[PDB]
Amino acid sequence: MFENITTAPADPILGLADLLRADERPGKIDLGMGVYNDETGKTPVLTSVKKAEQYLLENETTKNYLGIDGIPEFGRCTQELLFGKGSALINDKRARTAQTPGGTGALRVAADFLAKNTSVKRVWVSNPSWPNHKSVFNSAGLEVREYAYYDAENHTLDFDALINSLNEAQAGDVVLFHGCCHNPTGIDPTLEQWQTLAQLSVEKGWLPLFDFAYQGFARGLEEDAEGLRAFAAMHKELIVASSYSKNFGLYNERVGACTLVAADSETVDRAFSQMKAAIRVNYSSPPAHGASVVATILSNDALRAIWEQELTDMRQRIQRMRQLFVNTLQEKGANRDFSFIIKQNGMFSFSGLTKEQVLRLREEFGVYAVASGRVNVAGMTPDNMAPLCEAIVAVL
Amino acid sequence: MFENITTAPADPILGLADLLRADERPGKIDLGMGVYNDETGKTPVLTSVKKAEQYLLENETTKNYLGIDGIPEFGRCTQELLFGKGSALINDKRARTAQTPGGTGALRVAADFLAKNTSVKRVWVSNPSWPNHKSVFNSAGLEVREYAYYDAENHTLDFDALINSLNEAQAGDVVLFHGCCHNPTGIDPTLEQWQTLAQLSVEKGWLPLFDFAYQGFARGLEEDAEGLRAFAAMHKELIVASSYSKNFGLYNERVGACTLVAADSETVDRAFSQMKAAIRVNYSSPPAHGASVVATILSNDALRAIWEQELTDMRQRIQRMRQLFVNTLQEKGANRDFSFIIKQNGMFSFSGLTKEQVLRLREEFGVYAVASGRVNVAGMTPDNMAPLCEAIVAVL
Numbered sequence: 045m046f047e048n049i050t051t052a053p054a055d056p057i058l059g060l061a062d063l064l065r066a067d068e069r070p071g072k073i074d075l076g077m078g079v080y081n082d083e084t085g086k087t088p089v090l091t092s093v094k095k096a097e098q099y100l101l102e103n104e105t106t107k108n109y110l111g112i113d114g115i116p117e118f119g120r121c122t123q124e125l126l127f128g129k130g131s132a133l134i135n136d137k138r139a140r141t142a143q144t145p146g147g148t149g150a151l152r153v154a155a156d157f158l159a160k161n162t163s164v165k166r167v168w169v170s171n172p173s174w175p176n177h178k179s180v181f182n183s184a185g186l187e188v189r190e191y192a193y194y195d196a197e198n199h200t201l202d203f204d205a206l207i208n209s210l211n212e213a214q215a216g217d218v219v220l221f222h223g224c225c226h227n228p229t230g231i232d233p234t235l236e237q238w239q240t241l242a243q244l245s246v247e248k249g250w251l252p253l254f255d256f257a258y259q260g261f262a263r264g265l266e267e268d269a270e271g272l273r274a275f276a277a278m279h280k281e282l283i284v285a286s287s288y289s290k291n292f293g294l295y296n297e298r299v300g301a302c303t304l305v306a307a308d309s310e311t312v313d314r315a316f317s318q319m320k321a322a323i324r325v326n327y328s329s330p331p332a333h334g335a336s337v338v339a340t341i342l343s344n345d346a347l348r349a350i351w352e353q354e355l356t357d358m359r360q361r362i363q364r365m366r367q368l369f370v371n372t373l374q375e376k377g378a379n380r381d382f383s384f385i386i387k388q389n390g391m392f393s394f395s396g397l398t399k400e401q402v403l404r405l406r407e408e409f410g411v412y413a414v415a416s417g418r419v420n421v422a423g424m425t426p427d428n429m430a431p432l433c434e435a436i437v438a439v440l
Numbered sequence: 441m442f443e444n445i446t447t448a449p450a451d452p453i454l455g456l457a458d459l460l461r462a463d464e465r466p467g468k469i470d471l472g473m474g475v476y477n478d479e480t481g482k483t484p485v486l487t488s489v490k491k492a493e494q495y496l497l498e499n500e501t502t503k504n505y506l507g508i509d510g511i512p513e514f515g516r517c518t519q520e521l522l523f524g525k526g527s528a529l530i531n532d533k534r535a536r537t538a539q540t541p542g543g544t545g546a547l548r549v550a551a552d553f554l555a556k557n558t559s560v561k562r563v564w565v566s567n568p569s570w571p572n573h574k575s576v577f578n579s580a581g582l583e584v585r586e587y588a589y590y591d592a593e594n595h596t597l598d599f600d601a602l603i604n605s606l607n608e609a610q611a612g613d614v615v616l617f618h619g620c621c622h623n624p625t626g627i628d629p630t631l632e633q634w635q636t637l638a639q640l641s642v643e644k645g646w647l648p649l650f651d652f653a654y655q656g657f658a659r660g661l662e663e664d665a666e667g668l669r670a671f672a673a674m675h676k677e678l679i680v681a682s683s684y685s686k687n688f689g690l691y692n693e694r695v696g697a698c699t700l701v702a703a704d705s706e707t708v709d710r711a712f713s714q715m716k717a718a719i720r721v722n723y724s725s726p727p728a729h730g731a732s733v734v735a736t737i738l739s740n741d742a743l744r745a746i747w748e749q750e751l752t753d754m755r756q757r758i759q760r761m762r763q764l765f766v767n768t769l770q771e772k773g774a775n776r777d778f779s780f781i782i783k784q785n786g787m788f789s790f791s792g793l794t795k796e797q798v799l800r801l802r803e804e805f806g807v808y809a810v811a812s813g814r815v816n817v818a819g820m821t822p823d824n825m826a827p828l829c830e831a832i833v834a835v836l
């Protein structure tokens with residue numbers, strides 16, 4: 045029965061891991077997958093996380109199944125982080141949160157939920173966008189359409205093109221927005237633009253779906269969520285797929301959440317019952333460890349203070365590398381101006397390098413980046429900066 | 441968009457948790473979901489597991505993403521447990537294993553894989569069977585058909601009916617078998633019957649799919665796998681969805697695996713690439729903690745010895761309760777003979793109680809069992825045995 049199965053195509057991002065594995069060369073530079081690296085080029089476990097894991101080791105008395113929607117505390121802490129401690133959405137009980145295996149897991153649950161329980165047929169994603177977005181929604185039988193977003197020539201957000209692109213979006217359509225730190229551009233809408241988009245969305249009858257995987261990496265926890273909050277203030281219904289993989293450094297523990305918002309508690313509870321049905325037939329219930337670590341940290345003043353500082357330290361080291369990257373490129377004799385990357389938020393730099401240049405960097409210099417020209421700044425260190433830039437300058 | 445969504449129907453097994461939650465009554469007896477309880481009526485963390493978690497706390501240096509298929513060591517230890525340390529399948533590299541979020545997660549991955557990459561259209565499950573089996577395969581767009589299995593009158597396996605039921609199964613069809621400790625009957629085929637089924641399967645051209653969630657709870661680790669091994673000795677292709685939720689007491693960490701077997705390594709690697717594609721669009725990569733605990737224990741002589749003993753202790757306590765259950769029923773003046781339950785393996789007892797009797801036990805006595813008459817023996821203790829049996833005797 046498996047005789048004629050075809051070899052699956054490699055994933056443009058996750059597949060870089062395999063190539064890096066095979067590459068036997070010494071000083072390879074991994075600037076692919078978006079994982080944080082410290083000055084040493086290692087991806088350490090946060091101290092706040094180790095302390096939480098210590099706590100769980102001493103106090104956990106059972107591994108009995110969690111409910112289908114996960115740890116209740118995790119859900120509450122997640123909603124406060126997203127909407128604000130005294131949000132009306134929380135007080136009016138208009139939101140329900142399911143703990144999921146990572147933000148990717150949240151996206152799949154949302155997709156299965158939409159495909160089977162609503163009239164939704166199309167999902168609009170930005171151009172360019174995170175490649176797995178199309179893949180996930182397509183697997184659920186939903187078609188994906190793109191809306192203009194990045195201006196490759198001016199390295200900025202083409203708001204006019206965005207609006208015009210979306211005018212082709214019909215009521216009942218889902219429009220996907222990145223909460224902050226747009227992946228891969230790093231360009232986010234200003235608050236004014238978020239507000240304008242919120243109003244337009246309501247009038248056009250779109251169902252907003254936020255992919256929020258980098259809260260805290262743009263400006264701060266609360267600041268990075270003002271766009272989503274602007275939307276939540278005007279919409280009756282919303283869906284948020286969030287992830288703690290990056291802001292907690294819990295990548296492999298698969299910690300995320302899918303939050304559903306409706307007009308009232310009666311409606312959201314009803315809809316949420318179908319989201320739980322979608323989860324039941326997938327993985328049944330979520331993994332406890334990762335989410336337990338997050339809930340423990342967020343609900344403890346001491347641990348929370350330490351975690352917030354570590355998040356601040358991560359954000360600041362990336363910003364340092366970002367400036368050092370541009371300066372070194374100029375220092376090494378860069379062909380063109382790369383100052384526009386200082387304007388991008390998050391772990392990435394949408395460099396503008398062509399597919400061939402990326403291929404050559406890998407082949408001839410052992411420098412690994414995503415074919416789209418996306419480079420992981422968080423993977424840069426004072427030690428690999430020099431050879432990194434010499435290679436780039438060499439392919440311009 | 442969520443205005444007209446319908447309330448999802450409650451799950452016959454997982455839904456018992458919610459009801460137990462609402463029930464404010466004092467001495468409720470939970471004999472529903474299949475989770476192990478000790479003499480105290482608690483579901484403790486195994487000692488071997490706590491020691492492993494200790495080890496990980498001290499040695500883990502990163503939470504960086506695992507590969508799509510999980511921890512390689514976990515996969516190897518899983519294959520040895522299933523096929524045998526010196527199995528030809530392992531030596532000829534005919535098997536690939538993906539770490540998944542629980543056995544349920546493995547079933548979903550298998551289903552998505554089959555639905556999109558093969559001509560499979562039907563899956564045959566036993567009557568009766570684990571309710572989520574139909575639900576999971578149906579969600580992937582595959583139809584489920586039932587084959588005779590349990591003889592409600594003689595409380596045994598009706599092998600003749602089984603064979604005749606399956607003669608309606610066409611080549612290319614998937615036939616699902618429980619590795620051991622059939623859920624909910626507790627009745628497994630003898631080795632001779634497994635062998636006969638293996639031969640028939642090959643001749644009819646069926647694709648066997650084993651749900652192996654209770655390895656070690658029938659007779660022992662190796663013994664409980666002889667049925668699967670009989671099949672693996674004659675088939676070119678097989679799929680095994682296994683779980684460590686019960687034999688390791690790791691329920692909420694979601695630890696399972698989906699193992700794919702093909703004629704040769706070239707074919708299995710090709711097919712496996714599509715299984716990874718199916719996982720990529722679901723949860724991306726699996727949760728590390730649970731599987732790390734399992735790999736650590738299985739690859740360490742010391743920890744493995746302790747774990748195997750704990751497994752033995754769990755199996756023996758259930759067997760004790762099983763005999764005490766029958767004796768107490770007779771002692772309390774049971775209507776009919778219940779000795780047939782001594783012949784059932786696993787945590788359950790397929791009692792024969794009707795839907796109304798189960799409803800009444802819950803309503804009037806606070807005793808919770810599954811509507812099918814399935815009762816969790818592992819949930820029985822010397823303390824709740826008396827009131828438990830008095831309630832049952834009262835509804836006969």
Ligand SMILES: *Cc1c(COP(=O)(O)O)cnc(C)c1O
Pocket residue numbers: 078145146147148149174222227255257286287288289290295298299300723724
């Ligand atoms: C990291 C990320 C996610 C979710 O990642 P998980 O590892 O599955 O939690 C989703 N969308 C984007 C754009 C991301 O960068």
Ligand SMILES: *Cc1c(COP(=O)(O)O)cnc(C)c1O
Pocket residue numbers: 327328474541542543544545570618623651653682683684685686691694695696
């Ligand atoms: C426990 C069980 C599973 C898998 O359970 P998980 O908790 O998802 O690992 C699958 N099939 C049967 C029949 C089971 O009893």
